[PDB]
Amino acid sequence: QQQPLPVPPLLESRRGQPLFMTVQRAHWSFTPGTRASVWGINGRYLGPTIRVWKGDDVKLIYSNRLTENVSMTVAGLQVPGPLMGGPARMMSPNADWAPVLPIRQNAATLWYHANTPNRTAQQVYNGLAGMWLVEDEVSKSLPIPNHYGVDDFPVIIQDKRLDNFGTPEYNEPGSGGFVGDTLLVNGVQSPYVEVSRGWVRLRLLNASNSRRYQLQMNDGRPLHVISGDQGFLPAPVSVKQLSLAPGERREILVDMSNGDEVSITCSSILVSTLVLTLRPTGLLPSLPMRLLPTEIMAGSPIRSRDISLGDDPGINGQLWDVNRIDVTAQQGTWERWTVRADEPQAFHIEGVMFQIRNVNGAMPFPEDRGWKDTVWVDGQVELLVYFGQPSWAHFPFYFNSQTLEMADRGSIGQLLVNPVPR
């Protein structure tokens, strides 16, 4: 018998007031199993789901109540380098950080997490992560499920290794990324979610240190993808197996009208491949033919770049160097980036949005044709990157392996985006 899917509380303003985020040990009552502690935001394991609106200027007030330094970031958020932030905006124990974020991007499922240099893998694993939703006029008008915690749920996936009491424990891997043998969704092992007989929206986010998931429905039906690291696809895409690498987000719609139960499923070997069970209640209450009003146009790349990742920490043969700018781009411009990895892993770029143009010389799958900020690289990919945000030498954007331990080990590069205007 599984436990109910925990629904992170929705944290939004509306009154132009600040969103308070206290990084702290989770309450025992939110901690599994019953001995070791875990972390989160505001007393929870993991954090609340933030919801903001395109056009808002949101005041975030972070407070660090942990015994070590913590820097927090919103992955996929389009803001200037100094607002990201990272090591230059790190919070010492008991200190705070109150940035004002100008939300200007389209609707998307983003996420926030600790990005403390050297401690990212451990801090995210410990529970320093949560979902971040951007809503806009488009998402508000779409005929899709949107009642948060009713027919629209966050699905935060993490693979862990539990101690003798059922509490996730971390052991730094000697090589590569951390891999667990137990799946947790929103902090619970293979939970179920009770839904009515209609469409349900799941916002899938891979918040694991390194594991890449290959998701499918246990009854063989297709997964109807509607987004989108950086937003909606032009129209829904129905796939049999969905890849979800660390840091990727995809929103799917599941039709529970048949009144039957359906589960999403995925050494190294997992104790269970059960991700989330959609348990019908018998209650009664398609999909849209188009999501985005326009399959948005991409610009002409003025330059190309080549990025190489491997089984050894570093990018392009170099470890991350805070003093070194690896790429200098011009804001408002487009570039073609070729990313290669002989050791399969996800790749993330801060301060941009990109469209995958080719995967190993072939077309990318439909679910991968919208705007993104994270990509699974197994061989080579070609990206059409847009630099819509500015950054500065001491507040650069990072591009990195999404394998958390690898990033911690130096698989990070620095991107300077000269401001336009200036």
Residue numbers in the entry: 30 to 295, 312 to 330, 335 to 471
Quote the paper.
SufI is a water-soluble, periplasmic protein. The sequence of SufI shows that it is a member of the multicopper oxidase superfamily. The overall structure of SufI is very similar to that of CueO and contains three cupredoxin-like domains. Indeed, access to the region of the structure that forms the active site in multicopper oxidases is blocked in SufI by highly conserved residues. Together, these observations suggest that SufI is neither a copper-binding protein nor an enzyme.
The two molecules of each asymmetric unit are essentially the same within experimental error (rmsds over 408 and 406 Cα atoms of 1.1 and 0.9 Å for the orthorhombic and monoclinic crystals, respectively). Of the two data sets, the orthorhombic crystals diffracted to higher resolution (1.9 Å compared to 2.6 Å). The structure of SufI, determined here at a resolution of 1.9 Å by X-ray crystallography, confirms that the protein belongs to the multicopper oxidase family. No electron density was observed for the hexahistidine affinity tag, with the exception of the arginine residue of the affinity tag linker in chain A of the orthorhombic structure. The main areas of difference between the two crystal forms lie between residues 42–47, 55–66 and 326–334. Residues 42–47 are found in a loop that leads into the first domain, while residues 326–334 compose the long linker between domains 2 and 3. The electron density for both of these regions was poor and often missing entirely for the side chains. This suggests that these differences between the two crystal forms arise from flexibility of the molecule in these regions. Residues 55–66 are found in an extended loop in the first domain: a short alpha-helical segment is present in this loop in the orthorhombic form, which is unravelled in the monoclinic form.
